[PDB]
Design an enzyme around this catalytic site. Structure first.
Site, mmCIF file in Angstrom:
data_model
loop_
_atom_site.group_PDB
_atom_site.id
_atom_site.type_symbol
_atom_site.label_atom_id
_atom_site.label_comp_id
_atom_site.label_asym_id
_atom_site.label_seq_id
_atom_site.Cartn_x
_atom_site.Cartn_y
_atom_site.Cartn_z
ATOM 1 N N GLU A 35 -10.438 0.047 -5.077
ATOM 2 C CA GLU A 35 -9.118 0.636 -5.013
ATOM 3 C C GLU A 35 -9.091 2.128 -5.383
ATOM 4 O O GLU A 35 -8.583 2.915 -4.611
ATOM 5 C CB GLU A 35 -8.155 -0.103 -5.952
ATOM 6 C CG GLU A 35 -7.848 -1.528 -5.512
ATOM 7 C CD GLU A 35 -7.051 -1.584 -4.222
ATOM 8 O OE1 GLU A 35 -7.027 -0.566 -3.496
ATOM 9 O OE2 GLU A 35 -6.443 -2.639 -3.939
ATOM 10 N N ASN A 46 0.613 5.042 1.571
ATOM 11 C CA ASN A 46 0.459 3.912 2.481
ATOM 12 C C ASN A 46 1.302 4.182 3.751
ATOM 13 O O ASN A 46 2.189 5.067 3.785
ATOM 14 C CB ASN A 46 0.824 2.576 1.793
ATOM 15 C CG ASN A 46 0.125 2.402 0.436
ATOM 16 O OD1 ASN A 46 -1.109 2.499 0.334
ATOM 17 N ND2 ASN A 46 0.916 2.157 -0.614
ATOM 18 N N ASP A 48 3.708 2.718 5.159
ATOM 19 C CA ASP A 48 5.155 2.517 5.053
ATOM 20 C C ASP A 48 5.812 3.644 4.225
ATOM 21 O O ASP A 48 7.009 3.622 3.955
ATOM 22 C CB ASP A 48 5.447 1.124 4.456
ATOM 23 C CG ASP A 48 4.953 0.962 3.003
ATOM 24 O OD1 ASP A 48 4.259 1.835 2.459
ATOM 25 O OD2 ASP A 48 5.250 -0.077 2.382
ATOM 26 N N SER A 50 5.294 4.278 1.115
ATOM 27 C CA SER A 50 5.141 4.053 -0.320
ATOM 28 C C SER A 50 3.798 4.708 -0.667
ATOM 29 O O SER A 50 3.079 5.161 0.231
ATOM 30 C CB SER A 50 5.103 2.568 -0.662
ATOM 31 O OG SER A 50 4.016 1.875 -0.089
ATOM 32 N N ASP A 52 0.333 4.339 -3.501
ATOM 33 C CA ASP A 52 -0.385 3.562 -4.501
ATOM 34 C C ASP A 52 -0.836 4.489 -5.599
ATOM 35 O O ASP A 52 -1.315 5.587 -5.314
ATOM 36 C CB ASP A 52 -1.613 2.942 -3.904
ATOM 37 C CG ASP A 52 -1.317 1.701 -3.098
ATOM 38 O OD1 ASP A 52 -0.171 1.221 -2.980
ATOM 39 O OD2 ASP A 52 -2.301 1.215 -2.541
ATOM 40 N N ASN A 59 1.609 -0.040 -6.240
ATOM 41 C CA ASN A 59 2.336 0.600 -5.179
ATOM 42 C C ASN A 59 3.789 0.677 -5.495
ATOM 43 O O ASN A 59 4.354 -0.214 -6.136
ATOM 44 C CB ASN A 59 1.959 -0.061 -3.824
ATOM 45 C CG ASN A 59 3.065 -0.877 -3.242
ATOM 46 O OD1 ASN A 59 3.629 -0.512 -2.218
ATOM 47 N ND2 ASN A 59 3.395 -1.986 -3.889
ATOM 48 N N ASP A 101 2.394 -12.882 -9.547
ATOM 49 C CA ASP A 101 3.471 -12.966 -8.545
ATOM 50 C C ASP A 101 3.409 -14.104 -7.514
ATOM 51 O O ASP A 101 4.422 -14.422 -6.888
ATOM 52 C CB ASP A 101 3.609 -11.593 -7.860
ATOM 53 C CG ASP A 101 4.736 -11.544 -6.861
ATOM 54 O OD1 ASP A 101 5.932 -11.631 -7.256
ATOM 55 O OD2 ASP A 101 4.406 -11.426 -5.662
HETATM 56 O O1 LIG Z 1 6.285 -8.582 -3.908
HETATM 57 CL CL1 LIG Z 1 7.194 -10.050 -4.250
HETATM 58 O O2 LIG Z 1 7.952 -10.979 -2.936
HETATM 59 O O3 LIG Z 1 5.966 -11.207 -4.329
HETATM 60 O O4 LIG Z 1 7.902 -10.032 -5.898
#
Ligand SMILES: [O-][Cl+3]([O-])([O-])[O-]
Ligand SMILES: [O-][Cl+3]([O-])([O-])[O-]
Ligand SMILES: [O-][Cl+3]([O-])([O-])[O-]
Ligand SMILES: [O-][Cl+3]([O-])([O-])[O-]
Ligand SMILES: [O-][Cl+3]([O-])([O-])[O-]
Ligand SMILES: [Cl-]
Ligand code: NI
Length: 129
Positions: A35, A46, A48, A50, A52, A59, A101
């Protein structure tokens, strides 16, 4: 700061990432190698729009605020610049949220592509852990 391999492994351990969510230390070292090349100041735009940030390239779309990423959440509740510090505390804390997550470490597409399945223990070999 550009960390040494064993130096980052020690730091990450001190910060409770060894086996966090089941991912041994070498998975963390490996993802940070690919990374940021162990560089706390790494930033990458990135596609989009955004960006990192940091050792673990967190990100701005979901995790930190940089103020220029429309639609973004700041789920780790921190300025993205706080992820570029030489002290990895904030990066580690935030990584713990990301890996928790749902997709574990697959959140880091470089971990999935370059670390997952491989001999990641190679990443902490020779280290006085
Ligand atoms: O980036 Cl999330 O939909 O997993 O919180
Ligand atoms: O220094 Cl490595 O890029 O072999 O961790
Ligand atoms: O270094 Cl790999 O990208 O073969 O884990
Ligand atoms: O993440 Cl490991 O301790 O297999 O290197
Ligand atoms: O658990 Cl150790 O500090 O003894 O290697
Ligand atoms: Cl916004
Ligand atoms: Ni020890």
């Amino acid at each position: 700061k550009v960390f040494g391999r064993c130096e980052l492994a020690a730091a990450m351990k001190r910060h409770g990432l060894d086996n966090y969510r089941g991912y041994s230390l070498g998975n963390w070292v490996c993802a940070a190698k690919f990374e940021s090349n162990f560089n706390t100041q790494a930033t990458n735009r990135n596609t989009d729009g955004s960006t990192d940030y940091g050792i673990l390239q967190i990100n701005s779309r979901w995790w930190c605020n940089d103020g220029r990423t429309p639609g973004s959440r700041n789920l780790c509740n921190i300025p993205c610049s706080a992820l570029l510090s030489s002290d990895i505390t904030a990066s580690v804390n935030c990584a713990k949220k990301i890996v928790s997550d749902g997709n574990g470490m697959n959140a880091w597409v470089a971990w999935r592509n370059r670390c997952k399945g491989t001999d990641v223990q190679a990443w902490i070999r020779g280290c006085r852990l």
